[PDB]
Design a protein around this ligand. Structure first.
Ligand code: A1IEL
Ligand code: ZN
Length: 258
């Protein structure tokens, strides 16, 4: 089964998931001088209720903060999107080294980590699972993290990691102010792409914010202490969980700014 280790890692996913070689795969290299400013794009409009977060868990591939998506208390609107997309989950990608941890790469710069905020089109589809199978079903906001001052807005997360060390562990996680984790500028790039983990579905409108947020090296090192293995299996650590960049295949990357 899939992961980021030598025998089950990204380079081997195309052996098992046909879509891994598809024409709309993510993540990509963003070349900032080659991106097209598009005046038809709209500003992002975000409303994230701190009561929406409920549980944090170790999936074996990252931590996952799950939100109550029963109704439209937390939504993303605007940007390239038609209608309202409902907040479902947040997770993080990193590498074994602080200078090569992100999924998207900007003018050759890989950041220390990348946060993904996953949302689904509830205006058109009745659930996350159904939306995940349609070209306009999902929207993922990407936020880069760069090494710097410790981020006090990550402290709630790092405090829980000891209780979710093994794959499948979960703990209560509520009153989380996700809005305060985002950077002050909501300028972004966008393109059509895919999930960056199996099943690699081509259902994602990517919105990658230009402005990175900070994290300390100590904070980021704590994530690598999560395991990719369950209780009572031989332990292996989740030291890296990012997919390499995929061919653009004629897709247009657009910028909200110039
Ligand atoms: C190591 O990274 C991850 O674990 C991870 C987990 C879930 C999701 S999207 C939710 C999802 C996918 C598949 C099935 C159910 C939910 C993504 S992504 N990078 O495509 O935004 C990445
Ligand atoms: Zn992700």
């Amino acid at each position: 089964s899939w992961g980021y280790r030598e025998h089950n890692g990204p380079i081997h996913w195309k052996e098992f998931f046909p879509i891994a070689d598809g024409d709309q795969q993510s993540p990509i290299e963003i070349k900032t001088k080659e991106v097209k400013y598009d005046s038809s794009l709209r500003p992002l409009s975000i409303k994230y209720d701190p009561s929406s977060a409920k549980i944090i868990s170790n999936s074996g591939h990252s931590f996952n903060v799950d939100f109550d998506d029963t109704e439209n208390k937390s939504v993303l609107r605007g940007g390239p999107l038609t209608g309202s997309y409902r907040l479902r989950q947040v997770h993080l990608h990193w590498g074994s080294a602080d200078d090569h941890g992100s999924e998207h790469i900007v003018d050759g710069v890989s950041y220390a980590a990348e946060l993904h905020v996953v949302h689904w089109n509830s205006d058109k589809y009745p659930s996350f699972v159904e939306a995940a199978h349609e070209p306009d079903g999902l929207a993922v906001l990407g936020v880069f993290l760069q090494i710097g001052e410790p981020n006090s807005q990550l402290q709630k997360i790092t405090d829980t990691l000891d209780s979710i060390k093994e794959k499948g562990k979960q703990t209560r996680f509520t009153n989380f102010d996700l809005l305060s984790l985002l950077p002050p500028s909501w300028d972004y790039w966008t393109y059509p792409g895919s999930l960056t983990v199996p099943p690699l579905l081509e259902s994602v409108t990517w919105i990658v914010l230009k402005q990175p947020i900070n994290i300390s090296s100590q904070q980021l090192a704590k994530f690598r202490s999560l395991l990719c293995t369950a209780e009572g299996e031989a332990a292996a650590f989740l030291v890296s969980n990012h997919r390499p960049p995929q061919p653009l295949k004629g897709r247009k990357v657009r910028a909200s700014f110039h």
